[PDB]
Design a protein around this ligand. Structure first.
Ligand SMILES: [Mg+2]
Length: 171
């Protein structure tokens, strides 16, 4: 059972990038993707950093399954990361605080200014618990560069997630 939520990243945050963010030496398997523009790569770096820090985290985030997808905002500048996550120790009472701590320690290493991300959970007018079906019915049916990047540790999606052709098949 996997939770669902969104974090918005305004374009002003990209302006504050320091040398640890820009000079990342990551390889990024784009064998089945579109050429990722510089800022697209900055967001791919950020997403890989957050997944990396999450894979060996402790506390409530240890042993959790995650699926993060960063996309460009449809009508404005900026990006938004669709966050689907669930794991032992993870409940509705700590989801927001855990996600904000995780994402901000990574962002802090890569920025010159004091920034904070606000997590917005899927909820009716009760936290949503359809994350696996949210991944299947919506997040995975986007084709780049509508979706900019994606990271996951869920068996099955570990590779079928950064493959443009597989995303193009559901279309
Ligand atoms: Mg979206």
């Amino acid at each position: 059972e996997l939770f669902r939520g969104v974090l918005h990243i305004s374009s002003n945050i990209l302006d504050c990038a320091n040398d640890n963010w820009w000079c990342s030496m990551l390889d990024l398997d784009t064998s089945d993707w579109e050429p990722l523009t510089h800022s697209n790569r900055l967001m791919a770096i950020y997403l890989s950093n957050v997944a990396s820090r999450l894979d060996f985290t402790g506390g409530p985030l240890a042993g959790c399954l995650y699926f993060f997808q960063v996309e460009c905002n449809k009508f404005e500048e900026g990006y938004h990361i669709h966050v689907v996550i669930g794991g032992p120790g993870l409940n509705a009472r700590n989801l927001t605080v855990c996600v904000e701590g995780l994402f901000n320690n990574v962002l802090y290493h890569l920025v010159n200014e004091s920034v904070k991300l606000k997590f917005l959970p899927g909820m009716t007018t009760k936290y949503f618990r359809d994350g696996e079906q949210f991944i299947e019915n919506y997040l995975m049916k986007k084709i780049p560069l509508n979706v900019v990047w994606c990271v996951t540790n869920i068996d099955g999606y570990i590779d079928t997630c950064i493959s443009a052709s597989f995303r193009r098949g559901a279309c």
